[PDB]
């Protein structure tokens with residue numbers, strides 16, 4: 001069959017978010033609140049196109065919007081964020097409940113210096129609507145033509161001509 | 172019976188039996204063509220109902 005089309009290695013170069021998972025988990029709710037729109041544009045494009053190769057640029061926007069998220073933490077609130085993700089980082093399951101006072105200090109410093117409200121219980125799991133300018137994929141499965149069905153039954157049912165027609169039976 | 176009655180009764184019998192014979196030959200040919208091609212209402216062995224397929228957004232996108 002045909003040749004698969006891989007993008008170049010230059011099309012895969014982006015400035016990586018080189019932080020650990022406890023840094024991401026400590027900043028997760030404010031990341032979902034602030035970096036909402038390009039993340040949801042990317043995931044809409046990702047569930048609609050069903051191809052990562054059709055989703056690179058929006059993905060780069062995700063990797064563009066995460067970094068601007070962290071710099072805006074790193075400029076203003078590096079101390080409560082560091083003290084909070086260290087405590088998140090201690091736990092082997094990375095519990096939020098072990099770290100509520102560092103969470104409260106990080107939320108206080110962020111709400112004072114940046115005005116970000118942490119999302120309540122239920123908010124980040126909502127199904128949201130996304131207004132994009134890319135087109136809807138008309139054939140996302142790349143399906144070819146389907147076979148035509150067999151012709152249906154039509155016409156009023158007349159009796160059997162001369163019955164069963166079984167060898168000598170007249171009905 | 173009259174020769175008229177037996178004669179025309181015989182012709183009615185011959186019409187009925189010749190029509191039955193032509194229809195039996197057609198029945199053989201129809202069964203042969205439908206088993207060969209599968210495009211008639213007979214020999215329609217089932218395939219999977221596509222009303223069973225889930226069309227919701229799944230947990231992972233590539234599907």
Ligand SMILES: CCCCCCCCCCCCCCCCCC(=O)OC[C@H](COP(=O)([O-])OC[C@H](O)COP(=O)([O-])OC[C@H](COC(=O)CCCCCCCCCCCCCCCCC)OC(=O)CCCCCCCCCCCCCCCCC)OC(=O)CCCCCCCCCCCCCCCCC
Pocket residue numbers: 168169170171
């Ligand atoms: C106003 C509203 C009301 C109106 C009412 C109008 C009517 C008023 C009268 C009411 C009564 C009507 C009766 C029914 C209509 C006539 C049917 C008829 O005679 O068909 C002839 C039928 C076909 O001959 P036909 O000349 O081409 O057709 C004449 C009509 O057009 C026949 O018409 P058809 O072409 O439309 O017939 C359709 C088709 C015509 O037939 C065919 O297309 C051919 C296939 C027939 C079957 C062949 C099977 C062969 C292999 C098995 C053989 C078994 C062994 C034989 C018997 C052993 C002893 C029991 O019939 C069948 O296929 C059915 C099978 C035969 C059943 C006949 C009725 C039996 C009822 C009483 C049963 C009593 C026992 C009988 C003996 C058991 C065996 C039947 O003859 C035979 O098949 C030969 C055997 C005789 C059958 C039974 C005769 C009925 C009277 C029996 C009285 C004596 C009983 C003695 C005691 C018990 C036995 C020891």
